[PDB]
Amino acid sequence: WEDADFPILCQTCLGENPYIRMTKEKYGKECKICARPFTVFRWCPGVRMRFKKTEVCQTCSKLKNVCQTCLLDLEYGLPIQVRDAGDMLLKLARTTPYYKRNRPHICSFWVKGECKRGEECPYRHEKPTDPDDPLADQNIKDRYYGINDPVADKLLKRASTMLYVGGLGDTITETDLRNHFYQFGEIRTITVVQRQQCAFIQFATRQAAEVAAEKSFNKLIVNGRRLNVKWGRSQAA
Amino acid sequence: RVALEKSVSQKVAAAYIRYTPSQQGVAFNSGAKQRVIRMVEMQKDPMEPPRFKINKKIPRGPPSPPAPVMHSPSRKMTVKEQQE
């Protein structure tokens, strides 16, 4: 009921290898979250990887903006709950996507105690990360819908828990920085130093500059550059 | 004739790849500019039952190109021919 040509895959789900080998299967395995026949193709993401496959069908994933086998995203890399309830996502995402997803899951013969395959276990010989946290407990359908994620609340509270600015060069100038501070409020004493390519700004009672501390934790992206920010003295040292 | 032969073969059986990841891949797994991968077909053994007996696969959308007719304009014949 649903054939295609190429999978809508991730960039990490494909693998850390520029040449992989897919294997199309016309009408296999019955899509996880809509129960429809679709075109399953698996591959090997890299050496000693997990032989990843394709779960969520073409219309299933294309409609809801999500990858066919991890349900995170093609545009960002966040879950489908964070990218719906929550912008903040751009500083919340990551480049260089960890290949801790494409690895074999835990050898249950080892967990019981007698993994007979010895060193030849094509599974993975670590200990099972304890059951108690709800990141032992997520499923597919609750993940794929926005309703009830164990991950998305735990990453959504990373989004609200947690001055020497430099990296000026030839893009940042003094008037652009003081007008980007002018929307926050008024100055008391500002300066720009060019031997270290840095700027010093203050505020009446911080606060407004406090959300600048929310704005500039490797996050204030003006003039196409990730600016460098660490703390000032505030101690007359 | 080739299209009809393919359609008849489908009715009788019914009744590499180079894709550049130009979506999010910029620095994560650096070096993927063409993503040369091979896509083969799985050899299905001819001793197997069918996957199902019924399904609800939505093939496509019913919205077609509703363009105008552009044949002629509409009018009336006569006042007496209307009563005739």
Binding site: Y19, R21 | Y16, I17, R18, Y19, T20, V36
Partner: peptide, 18 residues
Amino acid sequence: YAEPAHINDFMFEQQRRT
């Protein structure tokens, strides 16, 4: 953006192994 290809089998697999 995906498209087909007609690429060298031997060198494809060789670079993969490498």
